[PDB]
Amino acid sequence: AVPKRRKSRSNTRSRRSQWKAAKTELVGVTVAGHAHKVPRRLLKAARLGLIDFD
Amino acid sequence: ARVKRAVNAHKKRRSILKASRGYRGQRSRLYRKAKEQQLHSLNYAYRDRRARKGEFRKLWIARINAAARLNDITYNRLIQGLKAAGVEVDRKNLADIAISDPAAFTALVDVARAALPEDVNA
């Protein structure tokens, strides 16, 4: 099966705009006084110092 | 002498693309497709310039019929009576009158009704 004809700009764009990244929600944490923002699932690691904030 | 085509050849391309502004798809972007759409567009415009006279007459007739039946007479007999009375007011102006001066339209209806024959079926 091969495409019968090339898609139109609108038809291509409607599908192409659905390929996007989901944004992760971030919470606030303070380590050694400095305050950072981390994803909530890493809150325990951030508190215990296993997170390298760079 | 050898002549490059580009300078001469771009004039019709620019004109066609300028004329095809507002089309959607390839029809406003590519010269070859805009050319075909231009052919169709100008044929449609030529046909519709002639057909719109009939369309406007149709609209006028409909509005005149509405006003006549409001004044209790058919379009049939209103036109026949106006012809008999020798009133040569246009259909366009008749519709304009019907919308703008209903009293004048009523007066015209009485004139046509008077000019109508005593029995229209003889």
């Binding site: - | 007011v89 366009k92 001066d101 007066a107």
Partner: protein, 100 residues
């Protein structure tokens, strides 16, 4: 008051002070023209009669000569190689109604 003036093969509903674009008249700019009418409404009266109307004319003043919109024609037929381009620009005359 207003009237239905006949000119150039067409009819126009005009009142005093109106400006109308009509077909070209062989009249220069500035001078006056008198035109026949098909109906005169002066409130409740319509006068609806050839004899009474033939003695009434509207007086207009030629405001100038203009042109209609440019019309482009490109006649075309399906599989023939037939094409025909053509342009047109109708000549018009502008009237200012001052009479009735």
């Amino acid at each position: 008051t207003y009237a239905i003036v006949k000119t150039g093969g067409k009819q126009y509903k005009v009142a005093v002070g109106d400006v109308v674009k009509v077909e070209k008249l062989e009249s220069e700019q500035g001078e006056k023209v008198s035109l026949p009418v098909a109906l005169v409404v002066d409130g409740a009266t319509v006068t609806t009669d050839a004899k009474a109307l033939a003695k009434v004319a509207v007086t207009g003043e030629v405001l100038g000569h203009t042109k209609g919109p440019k019309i482009r024609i490109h006649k075309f037929k399906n599989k023939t190689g037939y094409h025909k381009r053509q342009g047109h620009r109708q000549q018009l005359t502008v009237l200012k109604v001052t009479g009735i």
